[PDB]
């Protein structure tokens, strides 16, 4: 009966039943295989995290694109039968995706759902618009920036503005890699796959967004007041200085990792510029930030500052970035699925069988 | 007057005067101390090699990182006053390093130069780019793989592409250790430090790179035609079979020693992929192999094969690996130092004193 | 039917039937031949010990390597027909070995089993992993240090970590020889082969591991409170002072006998360092000590102290060294053989005949 929402993010798999205010199964989208000889052939999610020291971990998803279907399928298997404990044929499902992903990706997923899982009916939604539902708004700009891919979708009074959707491949995993390089110059070394996950943990705890990056650098140079300590799994102590903010800074200056794209504050701005002047004001007053990377301390304030400078004077910049923004997409899914209007939008197996995979593009 | 170039490799210390086409002082970066009681407190380089049977030998450098400053300093002392016979305050010096070494390492070296040696001016350069100068090119990919650390730096028309520099700790010393383990299963035993050096000598003479590793294994199993004889210092005879190529194979399959990194042929490829499509062709046609590990017979051909498979069809893979590639870095140093443009880049003691150690990061 | 486990140690031959909690035949791996003229051509095990005064005793095994196949074969003969009273063709057999022994050794043994003894099926296992089974663990570090060779194998959740296996030739027999030299300076003399065995007996009774070697030396110098008396077979009385702990100290300081290897406490540590950081904690909490040399009083406490210093603060060092650790390998064999899963691993004569000796490397 009750629809099952499943957010196939590139970082975490967030699944749960519609109507709830929180996902029930949240775990890493990771498949691990034994690096050495010896006992499972592979481990998934928390299993992989638990035994990661001896596993080669792979992400089946990259930048919102499924690259390894075998592993992808495996995760879904694991999800439905081990995490949620539910037969998929009992419930409608809601899957999500990032804007502009290759159509083959979308269709392939659908195929699997109507073959391996025999899902009664399904629907694929844009992560951004779901986030908007969670925010209680019909107008605003959704900035979804998680592990996989950053994107920006302007929405106005319940209407889409597809011609101004931005996509930026700069995301959480890139910040991770960048951070590794920085830790290297500091005096450490994180190069194994298991080490990658450690690095991630550090980032999530000690990084923050400087208000004025340059002054923050100066202060860091001036003294050790910003330095923090992080204890590694084996008891060693990591001392971190200016890396605590030099890392996340990359979001505003992608050039740090060789990208030509402007920072996310300009990406947002640009999307706004692509919309007709009549609605720009409304969008300025309703920026919605969501997704894991928007969890950095002070990122909203930094964002405000950046936009304020770019935007015309007097155009109040209001940024909405509430607690739990990390799960706003999943929440949106819960909402939408429970919405009775929406029920007409389900894609049934019946329709699929008759029309073929192309049907999903609707 | 004439600048003094000094390649602080982890294997050999290669020093000489700029303008020459070859280093004048080439000897092992080893400091040895008497294992038993008895006469010097320590021996350096060839001294250590000469009396190694009764010495505990240490390398002050590991993976391009100086771990023992006292011994490091000692080697420089020995170099300047015993090998080159020259007072350091008379000449500018050029030191080298591998990409991504910890900044503390870099600065510490500099400090020593401006204290113990009172060097007029100095400069620290990346080993990879020097190699490129030696090859007479402004575009290509430098694969520097010596004793200490393997690294890969893509260069295009005189510009650096830092966002795609690869570092791989797999190097000559790891091959040495791996070989030891193999010799063990063969029926021998090399565990002392002196024995280590013997093993190294064997490697440098009898190992080669199989074109098709699997077929080579089959042939080795089939007959003794590949077996060679190596006479040990005490007159014993070592008979070596498939170890003659199973050892170097590790460079293409790091998993042999428990590493997760892909082989060097994929490392190179990956670096290329990280560069914008527009210049990938130029890089494919200009691979430059240098450093001691690229001395194995047929490694270039093997490399070509490997890359050819990975690269798109028709993308001519040209690998440049000339005679004397072993010293291309030193040669590059000779060139650069003699270059008149470069003179503006020297870091003077004056500047150092005013700005402090941080100045080297430029 | 019931599998027969046979631990071919360099010190003792420990054989018995799987399922039992103790070996049935335990005796010295010694073959003795009449030093003078006279009546058997040779004596084995306890026979040799009984008449050792007139025999030249040889060990067929050295450092885990069989050096004398004729004598080796003889011992097996003696074992099966005189100690266990059983025809070998009636039972599967389990043999053991130390890591990194020369492959020729392994194969030669196998050949004998399928020729002289016509063993139905057999398997060769690493002594270390068997010990782990006896400890009831799937994760830990096995420190096997007996008469022949000391080795260290890290195991994690049922998977091997071969790239971090350590081998140290320092073992019980070396301690014996060292002790002899010490007894000499004390005022005694043990140089005959028979005397060797006497020395061994002394060691096993009066030596212990000092917690703080230096302070223990000081105390020994201070007074005779540590001195003990040992009565020799002919009634003479040996008075032993600081040798009661100076001997075993060698395990922590191999330099005493001219070796370059670090002590066993660092050997263990080093193995740990070679494992990925993610699992180091688990290994620290599960050190397993087994084999005859770990029988010295207080060696576990000393070990803990040593590791505690080397390991990062807060990394609880737990050392497991239960009663009967002396036979943990044999016990492990009993367990494994009785394990039903394992039955698929037996190497049958059939397979051997078809593939040849190389088959054992699996």
């Amino acid at each position: 009966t009750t629809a099952l929402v499943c957010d196939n993010g590139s970082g975490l798999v967030k699944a749960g039943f519609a109507g709830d205010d929180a996902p029930r199964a949240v775990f890493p989208s990771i498949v691990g295989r034994p690096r050495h000889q010896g006992q499972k052939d592979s481990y998934v999610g928390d299993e992989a995290q638990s035994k990661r020291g001896i596993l080669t971990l792979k992400y089946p998803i990259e930048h919102g694109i499924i690259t390894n279907w075998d592993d992808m399928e495996k995760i879904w298997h694991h999800t439905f039968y081990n995490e949620l404990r539910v037969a998929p044929e009992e419930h409608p499902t809601l899957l999500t995706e990032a804007p502009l992903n290759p159509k083959a990706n979308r269709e392939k997923m659908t195929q699997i759902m109507f073959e391996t899982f025999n899902v009664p009916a399904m629907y694929v939604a844009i992560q951004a618009v779901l986030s908007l539902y969670a925010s209680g708004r019909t107008t605003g700009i959704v900035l979804d920036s998680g592990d996989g891919v950053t994107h920006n979708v302007p929405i106005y009074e319940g209407y889409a503005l597809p011609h101004a959707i931005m996509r930026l491949d700069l995301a959480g995993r890139d910040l991770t890699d960048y951070l590794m390089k920085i830790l290297t110059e500091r005096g450490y070394s994180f190069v194994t796959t298991a080490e990658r996950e450690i690095v991630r943990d550090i980032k999530e705890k000690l990084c923050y967004v400087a208000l004025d990056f340059e002054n923050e650098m100066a202060t860091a140079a001036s003294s050790s007041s910003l330095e923090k300590s992080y204890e590694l799994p084996d008891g060693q102590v990591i001392t971190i200085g200016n890396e605590r903010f030099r890392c996340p800074e990359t979001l505003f200056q992608p050039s740090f990792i060789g990208m030509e794209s402007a920072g996310i504050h300009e990406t947002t701005y640009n999307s706004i510029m692509k919309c007709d002047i009549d609605i720009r004001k409304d969008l300025y007053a309703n920026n919605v930030m969501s997704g894991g990377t928007t969890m950095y301390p002070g990122i909203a304030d930094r964002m405000q500052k950046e936009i304020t400078a770019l935007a015309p004077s007097t155009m109040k910049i209001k940024i909405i970035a509430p607690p739990e923004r990390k799960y706003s997409v999943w929440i949106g899914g819960s909402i939408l699925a429970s919405l009775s209007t929406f029920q007409q939008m389900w894609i049934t197996k019946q329709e699929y069988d008759e029309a073929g995979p192309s049907i999903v593009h609707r | 007057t004439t600048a003094l170039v000094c390649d602080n490799g982890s294997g050999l210390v290669k020093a000489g005067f700029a303008g020459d086409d070859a280093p004048r002082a080439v000897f092992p970066s080893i400091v040895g101390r008497p294992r038993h009681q008895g006469q010097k407190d320590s021996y350096v380089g060839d001294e250590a090699q000469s009396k190694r049977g009764i010495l505990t030998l240490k390398y002050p450098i590991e993976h391009g990182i100086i771990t023992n400053w006292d011994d490091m300093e000692k080697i420089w002392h020995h170099t300047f006053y015993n090998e080159l016979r020259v007072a350091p305050e008379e000449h500018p010096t050029l030191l080298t390093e591998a990409p991504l070494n910890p900044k503390a390492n870099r600065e510490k070296m500099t400090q020593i130069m401006f204290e113990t040696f009172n060097v007029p001016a100095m400069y620290v350069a990346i080993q990879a780019v020097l190699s490129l100068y030696a090859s007479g090119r402004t575009t290509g990919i430098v694969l520097d793989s010596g004793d200490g650390v393997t690294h890969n730096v893509p260069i295009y028309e005189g510009y650096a592409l830092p966002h795609a520099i690869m570092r791989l700790d797999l190097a000559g010393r790891d091959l040495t250790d791996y070989l030891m383990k193999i010799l063990t299963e063969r029926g021998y035993s090399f565990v002392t430090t002196a024995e280590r050096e013997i093993v190294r000598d064997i490697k440098e003479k009898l190992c080669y790179v199989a074109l098709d590793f699997e077929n080579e294994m089959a042939t080795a199993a089939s007959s003794s035609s590949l077996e060679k004889s190596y006479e040990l210092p005490d007159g014993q005879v070592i008979t070596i079979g498939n170890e003659r190529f199973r050892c170097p194979e590790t460079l293409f399959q790091p998993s042999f020693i428990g590493m997760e990194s892909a082989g060097i042929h994929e490392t190179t490829y990956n670096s290329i992929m990280k560069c914008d499509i527009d210049i990938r062709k130029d890089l494919y046609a200009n691979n430059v192999m240098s450093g001691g590990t690229t001395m194995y017979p047929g490694i270039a051909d093997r490399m070509q094969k490997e890359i050819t498979a990975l690269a798109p069809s028709t993308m001519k893979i040209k690998i440049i690996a000339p005679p004397e590639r072993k010293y291309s870095v030193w040669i590059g140093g000779s060139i650069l130092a003699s270059l008149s443009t470069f003179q503006q880049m020297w870091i003077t003691k004056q500047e150092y004193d005013e700005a402090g150690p941080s100045i080297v990061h430029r | 039917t019931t599998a027969l486990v046979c631990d071919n140690g360099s010190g003792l031959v420990k054989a018995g039937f799987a399922g039992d909690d103790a070996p049935r035949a335990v005796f010295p791996s010694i073959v003795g031949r009449p030093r003078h003229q006279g009546q058997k051509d040779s004596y084995v095990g306890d026979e040799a010990q009984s008449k050792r005064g007139i025999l030249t005793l040889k060990y067929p095994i050295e450092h885990g390597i069989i050096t004398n196949w004729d004598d080796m074969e003889k011992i097996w003969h003696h074992t099966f027909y005189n100690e266990l009273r059983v025809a070998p063709e009636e039972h599967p057999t389990l043999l053991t070995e130390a890591p990194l022994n020369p492959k020729a050794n392994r194969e030669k043994m196998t050949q004998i089993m399928f020729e002289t003894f016509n063993v139905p099926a057999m398997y060769v296992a690493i002594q270390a992993v068997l010990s782990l089974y006896a400890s009831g663990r799937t994760t830990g570090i096995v420190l096997d240090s007996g008469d022949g060779v000391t080795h260290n194998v890290p195991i994690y959740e049922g998977y091997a970590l071969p790239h971090a296996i350590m081998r140290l030739d320092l073992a019980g027999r070396d301690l014996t020889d060292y002790l002899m030299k010490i007894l000499t300076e004390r005022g005694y003399s043990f140089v005959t082969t028979a005397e060797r065995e006497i020395v061994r007996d002394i060691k096993e009774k009066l030596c212990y591991v000092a917690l703080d070697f230096e302070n223990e030396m000081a105390t020994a110098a201070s007074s005779s409170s540590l001195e003990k008396s040992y009565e020799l077979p002919d009634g003479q009385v040996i008075t032993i002072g600081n040798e009661r702990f100076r001997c075993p100290e060698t395990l922590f300081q191999p330099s005493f006998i001219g070796m370059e290897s670090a002590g066993i406490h660092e050997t263990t540590y080093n193995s740990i360092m070679k494992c990925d950081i993610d699992i180091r904690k688990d290994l620290y909490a599960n050190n397993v000590m087994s084999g005859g040399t770990t029988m010295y009083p207080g060696i576990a406490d000393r070990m803990q102290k040593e590791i505690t210093a080397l390991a990062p603060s807060t990394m609880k060092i737990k050392i497991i060294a239960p009663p009967e650790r002396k036979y943990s390998v044999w016990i492990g064999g009993s367990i494994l053989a009785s394990l039903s899963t394992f039955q698929q691993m037996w190497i049958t004569k059939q397979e051997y005949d078809e593939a040849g000796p190389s088959i054992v490397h699996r």
Partner: peptide, 7 residues
């Protein structure tokens, strides 16, 4: 290194 690897 001061973590990861020895150096």
């Amino acid at each position: 290194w001061x973590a990861x690897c020895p150096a």
